C-alpha cells in the first residue's frame, strides 16, 4: 500500500486499539476503487490465532444496509412497492392500527414506534403475528423516527414473501452470488467456523445469540475483503451487471426523510459532503442514534447524492463494525473489530483517515 495511506492508517488505528483495548481488527481503505488491508491483533485470544482477510466477523446492524438493498432489488423487479401497505403482505395483520403504514414506514423505522428490540419472548411465527397485532403505536406513521430492529426486520421478511424464497435463499441468490460475496453468511457454515472470530464482551469470548428477525436485522457475518467488495459496490452501482441490483443499491441511497442534517436511506444513512465531523461524530453516541426524533418527508425522495457521506454502524454484545465511503471521491472504509467500542471513537477514526486522503 502507498506509504501515504500506511501512515495515516496505523497513525490513527493503533492508538485506537490501545485506547479501547480491542483484541483484533480488520480495516479496508477503499482508495481510488482499490481496496487496502490491514489487520491487527486476534481473532482467539485463547487459541492465540491472529485476525486475517479471512477472519469473518459479526456485522451487526451493518447487516440492515443489506437487508436495504434486497428490498431495493425486489422493488427493481416489481415484486413489491414501497408505497404498499404492510397488511398487503401480511393479510393476517387485522388490527387497525396497521391502516396506513406502509414498507417504506417499516424499512425507515416512521411506522410509529415499533420496539427497538424484539422481546425474547417472540420465538414461533405466532408469537411475532401476536407481537405486532398487539402493539400500540405511539405516533402516526410517517412523522417520528424510531431506530428499531424490529421495524426494518419486518420489511425484510416481508420483501421477499412474493419471490416464494427464504430471507436466507434470497439474500445469497440475489445479493450475495451477484456480488461475490463468497465469504458473506447469515449462518456460518461448518467449513467455515475456523474463520469465526470470537467477540469480547467483559473479557468473555461471545458469538451473537439467536433472535427474532435476526437474519434480516443484525445477522450477517462478513469478512474484510467480502466487505470491501460491498463497499465498492455501493460506490459505483452503474457497474454492477445485475440490472435490478444496481437499481437496488440506488434506492437504498435515496433519501426518504431528514432529520437534522442526515437522510434516512434503505439502510444506509447519509449526510451532505463535506461534512461537519462533529454532524457525524456527535450524531453516533447511541443516546442520540437510537432517541425519539422528528421527520421531515422528502418528497419525492432525492435520488443516490453522489456527494454524501454514506455511513452505518453496528454491533452485537462482542463486535463493533462501521462502513462509511463518499462516491464522489471514490473513498470509502471499513473497520470490523471483536469489540464493541464507542460509537464516537469509530466515526473518528473513519473521518481522520478519509478526510487525510482527501
Ligand atoms: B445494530 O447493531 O444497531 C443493533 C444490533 C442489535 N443486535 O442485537 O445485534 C440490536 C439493536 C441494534
Known sequence: ???????????????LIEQQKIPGMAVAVIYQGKPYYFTWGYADIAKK????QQTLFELGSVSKTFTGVLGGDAIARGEIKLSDPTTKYWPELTAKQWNGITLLHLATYTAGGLPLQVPDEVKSSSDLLRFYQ???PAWAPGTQRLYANSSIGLFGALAVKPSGLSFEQAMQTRVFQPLKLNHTWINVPPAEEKNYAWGYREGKA?????????????????????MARWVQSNLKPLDINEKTLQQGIQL?????????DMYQGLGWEMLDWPVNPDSII????????????????????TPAVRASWVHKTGATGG????????????????MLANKNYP??????????????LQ
Request: charged share 15%; aromatic share 8%; no cysteine.
Open 1 to 15: 500500500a502507498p506509504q501515504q495511506i500506511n501512515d495515516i492508517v496505523h497513525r490513527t488505528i493503533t492508538p
Open 49 to 52: 490465532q491472529p485476525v486475517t
Open 206 to 226: 461471545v458469538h451473537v445469540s439467536p433472535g427474532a428477525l435476526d437474519a434480516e436485522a443484525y445477522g450477517v457475518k462478513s469478512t474484510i475483503e467480502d
Open 343 to 356: 460509537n464516537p471513537a469509530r466515526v473518528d477514526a473513519a473521518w481522520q483517515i478519509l478526510n487525510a
Open 134 to 136: 398487539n402493539w400500540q
Open 252 to 260: 437504498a441511497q435515496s433519501r426518504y426523510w431528514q432529520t437534522g
Open 282 to 301: 456527535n450524531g453516533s453516541d447511541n443516546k442520540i442514534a437510537l432517541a425519539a426524533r422528528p421527520v421531515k418527508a422528502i418528497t419525492p425522495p
Open 319 to 334: 463486535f463493533g463494525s462501521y462502513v462509511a465511503f463518499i462516491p464522489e471521491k471514490e473513498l470509502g472504509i471499513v
